[PDB]
Each structure stands twice: as C-alpha cells, then as structure tokens.
C-alpha cells in the first residue's frame, strides 16, 4: 500500500471510532492490504398477490454472506501481463481515446447537472455542498480525506453522495456527452434502449465475416488491472489544467488507491482494507470505463486473430508500426463489428480465427467464463440466439405483416424482480406504484410473453389509474423508463416501436393490442412460460376475482380501469 495516498483516509476512519479501533492479527485478507478494524453498529405485496403460480417456482422466489462473496470472488490476484502485452494495451487505449475525443471535448459537470439527475434528499442541504467543497479543496492540494467505499456483498461498492458528486464533476462528461454512444465509438451502445439492441445485433449479423462471438469475462470488475486503470486514465491528456487536477485526484483515490470498509457472540466488526487494482463497482463512470477497456480488449483479440500480433510480441513489442497501421486502416471497421455495453460484448470478426485468439486475452487476465482457458470460443450462427445484456432478441411480425425485433429473457427473472420491493415501512401506495412501473415496462418491452401481458394487465387493472409509477424496475442503462408515466401505454408503445423506431420504415400506427404479437408458443415455453400448466390456467381463469380483491385492499373508492377486458 502507498501509505502517502491512503494514510489520510485511514486516519480519518480511526478518528471516528478511536475507542473501538483494534488490529486483528487473524483477519482473513490475503490479496488486500489490511489496516485495522473497529466495532460496527422486502416483497411487493401487490405483485405477489397477482402472481400466485410463481410462489412455488424457485427461479422466481430465489431472486428475493458478504465475507463469503469477498473470499471467493474479490480476494484474488492475477499475474501482471507481459511487457509487450502492456505496450499493445497502452497503444490501443491511446488510439481509442483519441478517436473518441475527435468530435467531443471533455468538460466539468456541474452541481446543477447533478441536482437535476438526483430528482428522478441531502442535495437540497447547503451543508452537504460544504462537505463537497472541503473534500474538493483537499483534492486540489494532492490529498484525500473521505473517498472511501463501503463494500456490500457480485460485489457492490457503495460511496457517499459527496464522493459520487466529485467523480461526476471530473469524469461525468463521458456519460453526459455520450462518449460511448454508438455514433461516437462505433462499438458502444450507450443511450440505446432494449427496444433497439436487437436491431444492432441484426445489423452486425449482415457484416461479412465469421460467427458472432459473445464471450463473458468471469468477474470482469475483479479482472481490471492496474495497467487497465492507467490506460483508462489517459483521457486526462485531453483535459485543460483545472479540470485535469480534479480528474487526476478522482483517478488517484477512487480508482487506483482504493480504501474500503467491509463488515465481518453475535457481534460484528468493520475492517478497513485497500487495493490498487480492480474496478470499484458502482462508480458514476464504471460503465463507461468498462466499455472503453472492453473495446480495447476486443481490438487486441482481433489483432491477434488477424496475425498482426505474433506470440513473440507478448514478451516485448519490438516495432509498433504494424499495430498503428492496423488501427488506422481497420480500427473503425472493427469497432463497428462490435456491440459493447460495459463488460458485455458481441463481436463479428472478419473470420473465425477470433475463436482461438486467446494468448493476449489470457495474458491480460481477461479469462472467459464457463470455458476451459485454452478451449476455442464457440460462436453463434443465428443472431437471434446471441446473448447480450442478459437478453436475446427475436424478430416477430405485427398483424399487418411488419417485422419488429424484441428483447426477451427467461420469464422467471422478470417476475422474480417485480416481486422484490427495496425499502421497509412501505405503504400499499408506494408498493402499488412500483408494481405499476413493472407492469408498464412489461407492456412496452415484454408484451410478447403471454404470462407477462396478462399479469401486467391485471396489475394495471388493480392500481388506481391516476397513480404515477415510481421506483426503478432496473439499474441497466438500457432501461430508458418510457413506462414511468400515466400516458396510455398503447400510445407510448406506438411512439417507441413505430414513430421513433428508425428500423420501422412504415410509420402506420398500431391501434389495438391484439395487433401486437406474442412469441410462438414453443418459444414462450422455452423461455419459461407457464401457459398450459394447471396452476397458471387456474390463475388466469380466476384473475378478475384476484384483481377485485386487490382493488378492495387499495380502496374501492379509487378509480380503476379494466385492462383485462
Ligand atoms: C443486465 O440486466 C438488465 C438488463 C436489461 O437491459 C439491457 C434490462 C432492462 C429492462 C428494461 C429496460 S432495460 C434490465 C436488466 C435487469 O434489470 O436485470
Ligand atoms: Zn477524496
Ligand atoms: Zn426468449
């Protein structure tokens, strides 16, 4: 650990718990530096009432310990990549940052920009912004007192709103100005909704070349190296001095010299640990930086596949001109052959040599999940089967014959998520408004699933028509929230799928839900439908009674609409 960079944060924590602070010689940390310890101090009823057949489906109820996740997934170390591999990573990262910045200029994001985003509160308190100003002052002198994570076990690293603001101030431009949008990056998909991603995969399927590859990197955030963090930091070279000072401090304390608080006769202690590599999951620009580095990784894999990089280049890259020529000649074409959303990627290489191009990938520590380290990847011939962003995408037809490309995933995950309510002491109003959000999201994106179109209509029939949807149905950047409204969902469906859909040539509106298709029965069943299963048949036959019961609970004096008739 670099005690000159992390010492101030450790001292501040120690000062706040001086009388319980202690050093535990039997701590379980192996790859994280350990500094000390101190003594530390759900269910959506509306959806559950309307989804009885899923009470006994473990794929649903399972959706609703920290030390265990830490020991197995976060407390690991990987060897450094070889010198040649590191030179290739830096060259490709430098080239990519220059391409992304050709038509965009970095900028500082404002307090008002952050305030407008949070209203979707400590922000309306002048004392919170005073804390923010004090920490900024330390950063401008080369010090950090409070940019510390609280690790909560997949591992999510939390940070106080003030540190997130300082990160947004210095690097939020990557998000706000869409540096990873498809127009700017070629291979990125930032800003596209799930309603558009299938069309991107279908466009890629038509580019001549090999199969479509969609390999996952096992524990992506844990495999981000100190070299990846240095290459991501090259964006500071495009910033003016003042902005650069703010960004260099975020990179130094939040990204590269991290300090984390983790919990461990029924008593609990908090441990203070540190690590220089890995991605601190949950940062304001975690998604943009993951997309950046995954684009760099896939460009390198394509160079190895195309024999631009040879096995002698792992040890030392003697001559760099071949890599520069490949990036200038082919880089943009290869970026357009990718769809990269953070750690998720689909690549359409120029041939199938990509399947066995694993030397640089493995030397970089970007090991594929569920495949033997040196077994060639298996590509897909059918774009409709390619996994991307936890979905697959299928082409269906409206009653009038027009095709549409819709997102799909196994239905248990969707119902399981809708049955979860984050927050205790929640009234039936907050609960019903979050249920309405899920149901309207299903009407917009998963209308082609028989069980979800019915369940959504039952939920919408059970919640007062004037109640505004609230809460978050997903954390995915591809969930644009068009369903968070009291506007008629058939009107919103038309806006999303017809009017604003550049892949729908004929703009004729759709005037009835019966013109909007379902998947074929076989596909609906493959993806988890309970159509034809007796408990589901009973639930559908009894659905009007179940809706009347929910309306009685919420209040028969409210105004309801029958979306089931
Ligand atoms: C990785 O998983 C998420 C991805 C996905 O978008 C790509 C989903 C969306 C739903 C609605 C709009 S986007 C949400 C989903 C989730 O919450 O698990
Ligand atoms: Zn700080
Ligand atoms: Zn499906």
DSSP 468-489: PP-S-S---TT---TTSSSS-H
Q: Residues annotated in the binding site for Zn(2+), as ranges? A: 135, 139, 144, 147, 392, 408, 527
Question: Helix (H, G, I), strand (E, B), or coil: what is residue 416?
Answer: helix
426: left (phi over 0), alpha (psi -120 to 50) or beta: beta
278: left (phi over 0), alpha (psi -120 to 50) or beta: left
How far apart are the C-alpha atoms of 458 and 546, rounded to whole Å?
8
> Is there a contact between 390 and 108 (Cβ–Cβ < 8 Å)?
no
If you take atom 17 of ligand 1, which residue's CA is the nearest one?
474
Distance 416 CA to ligand 1 centre (A): 13
Task: List the determination method.
Answer: X-ray
Q: Tell me whether strands 258-263 and 149-152 are parallel, antiparallel or unpaired.
A: parallel
If you take atom 12 of ligand 1, which residue's CA is the nearest one?
479
* Residues 539, 544, 550, 552, CA torsion sign: negative
Phi, psi of 44 (to 5 degrees): -95, 105
How far apart are the C-alpha atoms of 119 and 299, rounded to whole Å?
38
* Residues 15, 16, 22, 26, CA torsion sign: negative
**Closest residue by Cα to residue 338 from 191, 204, 206, 207:** 204
Tell me the HSE value of 178 on the side-chain side, using a 13 A CA sphere: 12
Name, in order, each residue with C-beta under 8 angstroms of 46's C-beta and a sequence gap of 6 or more.
Answer: 428, 431, 432, 435, 459, 462, 463, 550
> Is there a contact between 501 and 508 (Cβ–Cβ < 8 Å)?
no
> Ligand 1 pocket test: which of 63, 389, 438 has the largest number of ligand atoms within 8 Å of its C-beta?
389
If you take atom 5 of ligand 1, which residue's CA is the nearest one?
476
> Is there a contact between 203 and 317 (Cβ–Cβ < 8 Å)?
no
Confirm or reject: Cβ of 474 under 6 Å from ligand 1: yes
**Closest residue by Cα to residue 384 from 212, 194, 187:** 212
Confirm or reject: Cβ of 479 under 6 Å from ligand 1: yes
Tokens of 161: 């709103």
Q: Which atom of ligand 1 is nearest to the CA of 413?
A: 18
Question: Helix (H, G, I), strand (E, B), or coil: what is residue 6?
Answer: helix
How far apart are the C-alpha atoms of 100 and 557, rounded to whole Å?
56
Confirm or reject: Cβ of 339 under 6 Å from ligand 1: no
Q: Which helix (H) or strand (E) holds 538?
A: helix 534-541
CA–CA distances in Å: residue 488 to residues 52, 187, 491: 27, 35, 5
How far apart are the C-alpha atoms of 458 and 384, rounded to whole Å?
30
The ligand whose atoms approach the alpha carbon of 135 most closely is 2
Distance 1 CA to ligand 2 centre (A): 17
The ligand whose atoms approach the alpha carbon of 442 most closely is 1
Torsion angle of C-alpha atoms 105, 106, 107, 109, degrees rounded to 10 = 130
Which residue, chain included where needed, has tokens 């894999």?
301
> Is there a contact between 384 and 212 (Cβ–Cβ < 8 Å)?
no
If you take atom 9 of ligand 1, which residue's CA is the nearest one?
479
CA–CA distances in Å: residue 93 to residues 213, 299, 501: 22, 10, 33
Phi, psi of 391 (to 5 degrees): -130, 170
* Residues 12, 15, 17, 21, CA torsion sign: positive
Resolution in angstrom units? 1.4
> Ligand 1 pocket test: which of 193, 194, 443 has the largest number of ligand atoms within 8 Å of its C-beta?
194
**Closest residue by Cα to residue 497 from 479, 480, 509, 512:** 509
**Closest residue by Cα to residue 2 from 281, 279, 232, 275:** 275
**Closest residue by Cα to residue 14 from 37, 43, 47:** 37
* Residues 354, 359, 364, 369, CA torsion sign: positive
Distance 388 CA to ligand 1 centre (A): 10
The ligand whose atoms approach the alpha carbon of 249 most closely is 2
How far apart are the C-alpha atoms of 445 and 488, rounded to whole Å?
15
Name, in order, each residue with C-beta under 8 angstroms of 15's C-beta and a sequence gap of 6 or more.
Answer: none
Going from N- to C-terminal start, the domains of the chain cover: 1-41+65-76+145-157+256-276, 42-64+390-565, 77-108+172-255+277-389, 109-144+158-171
Confirm or reject: Cβ of 390 under 6 Å from ligand 1: yes
How far apart are the C-alpha atoms of 164 and 425, rounded to whole Å?
27
**Closest residue by Cα to residue 151 from 10, 14, 294, 275:** 275
Question: Helix (H, G, I), strand (E, B), or coil: what is residue 156?
Answer: strand
> Is there a contact between 52 and 535 (Cβ–Cβ < 8 Å)?
yes
Tokens of 250: 């975020």
3-state secondary structure 73-123: HHCCCCCCCCHHHHHHHHHHHHHHHHHHCCCCCCCCCCHHHHHHHHCCCHH
């Amino acid at each position: 650990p670099n005690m000159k960079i992390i010492g101030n944060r450790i001292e501040r924590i120690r000062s706040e718990h001086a009388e319980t602070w202690f050093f535990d010689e039997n701590h379980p940390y192996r790859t994280w530096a350990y500094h000390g310890s101190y003594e530390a101090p759900l269910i959506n009823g509306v959806v559950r009432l309307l989804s009885k057949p899923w009470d006994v489906v473990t794929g649903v109820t399972g959706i609703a310990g920290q030390q265990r996740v830490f020991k197995e997934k976060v407390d690991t170390r990987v060897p450094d990549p070889q010198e040649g591999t590191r030179q290739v990573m830096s060259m490709v990262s430098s080239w990519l940052w220059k391409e992304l910045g050709k038509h965009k200029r970095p900028r500082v994001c404002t307090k008002e920009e952050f305030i407008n985003k949070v209203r979707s509160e400590a922000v309306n308190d002048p004392r919170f912004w005073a804390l923010v100003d004090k920490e900024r002052e330390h950063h401008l002198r080369g010090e950090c007192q409070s940019c510390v994570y609280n690790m909560m076990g997949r591992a999510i690293w939390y940070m106080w709103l003030g540190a997130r603001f300082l990160e947004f101030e210095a690097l939020g431009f990557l998000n706000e100005d869409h540096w990873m949008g498809r127009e700017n990056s070629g291979g990125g998909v930032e800003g596209l909704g799930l309603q558009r991603l299938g069309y991107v995969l279908e466009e890629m399927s038509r580019i001549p070349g090999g199969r479509m590859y969609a390999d996952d990197t096992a524990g992506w955030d844990t495999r981000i190296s100190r070299f990846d963090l240095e290459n991501e930091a090259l964006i500071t070279n495009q910033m003016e001095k003042g902005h650069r000072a703010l960004a260099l401090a975020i990179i130094k304390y939040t990204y590269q010299n991290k300090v984390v608080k983790v919990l461990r006769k029924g008593k609990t202690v908090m441990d203070i640990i540190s690590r220089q590599d890995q991605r601190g999951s949950g940062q304001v620009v975690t998604y943009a930086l993951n997309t950046f580095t995954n684009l760099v990784v896939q460009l390198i894999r394509n160079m190895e596949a195309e024999e631009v990089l040879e096995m002698q280049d792992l040890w030392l890259l003697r001559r760099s001109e071949k890599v520069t020529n490949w990036l200038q000649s082919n880089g943009w074409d290869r970026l357009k052959r990718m769809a990269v959303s953070g750690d998720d990627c689909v690549v359409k290489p120029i041939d199938d040599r990509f399947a066995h191009a694993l030397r640089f990938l493995n030397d970089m520590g970007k090991v594929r999940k569920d495949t033997q380290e040196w077994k060639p990847s298996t590509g897909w011939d059918n774009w409709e089967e390619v996994p991307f962003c936890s979905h697959h995408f299928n082409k269906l037809h409206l009653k009038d014959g027009r095709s549409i490309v819709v997102p799909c995933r196994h239905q248990d995950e969707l119902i399981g998520r809708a049955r979860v309510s984050p927050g205790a002491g929640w009234s039936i109003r907050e609960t019903a408004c979050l249920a309405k959000s899920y149901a309207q999201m299903w009407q917009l994106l998963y209308f082609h699933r028989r069980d979800l179109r019915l369940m959504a209509n039952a939920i919408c029939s059970s919640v007062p028509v004037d109640w505004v949807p609230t809460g978050r149905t997903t954390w995915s950047i591809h969930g644009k929230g068009e369903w968070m409204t009291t506007e008629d969902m058939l009107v919103v469906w038309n806006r999303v799928w017809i009017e604003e859909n550049d892949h729908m040539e004929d703009k004729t509106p759709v005037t009835k839900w019966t013109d909007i298709p379902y998947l074929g029965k076989r596909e609906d069943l493959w993806c988890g439908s309970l159509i034809g299963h007796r408990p589901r048949t009973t639930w559908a036959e009894n659905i009007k009674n179940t809706v009347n019961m929910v309306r009685r609970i919420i209040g028969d004096e409210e105004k309801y609409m029958d979306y089931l008739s």
